[PDB]
Structure 1
């Protein structure tokens, strides 16, 4: 008569990495985000969960969203984070800009790097 609990310390990382690979190939991706003229394919369940702006958007029909006021390479970073929990070796000047796009999109961790 006993209870067992187990935690998979590596789960989160492998999941996220599989999910990031999925979006690299468009696997299971149900939305396309267009920034400047670059198109990012992605998963609504992930963006909704992690972004208050996308949370708002995806409570209604929509397969395409067009964003302004944010550069493609900056948005690329927001996604990389959304799909890894990390920003990695970002250059110090792009930071202020990155922080702002996090603010616009409601990605708390990016918004609050300052």
Structure 2
């Protein structure tokens, strides 16, 4: 007779922090993204969910992907967003580059800054 519903407002945040902690260790990371002279380990499921570019890319098999036209430190910030919902203390002189990286990768919130 009785139907029960409940919503955990803390969940999606805790989950993202845990996913970011994993990423720091490379745990469960199933792709490496090479950007200039840097390699970033990440999770395909998260990248696919959050980037229209990666969503397209990860329909093809492959464990290493290479990005052109984005500087490593800018990609580092895009990934920090993907793994947190936030951009934190970005120099204003980098913002145009960050926006452009969001545009290229199809990360809507970043492209809209």
Superposition TM-score tier, normalisation by shorter sequence: over 0.9
Q: Give a deviation string over 1:18-66, Cα, whole Å, max 9, x none.
A: 0001010010000000001100000000000000000011001110001
Normalising by structure 1, we get a TM-score of 0.97
Normalising by structure 2, we get a TM-score of 0.97
- Structure 1, unaligned runs of 5 or more: none
Q: Give a deviation string over 1:40-95, Cα, whole Å, max 9, x none.
A: 00000000000000001100111000111101110000000000000011111110
Q: Distance in 2 between matches of 1:39 and 1:111?
A: 23
Structure 1 moving runs of 4+ over 6 Å = none
Name the residue aligned to 1:39: 39
Compare the two structures and name the one with the higher strand fraction.
1
Q: Distance in 2 between matches of 1:3 and 1:82?
A: 35
Total equivalences in the alignment = 113
**1:105 Cα shift?**
0.4
Secondary structure in 2 matching 1:76: helix
Q: CA RMSD in A?
A: 0.7
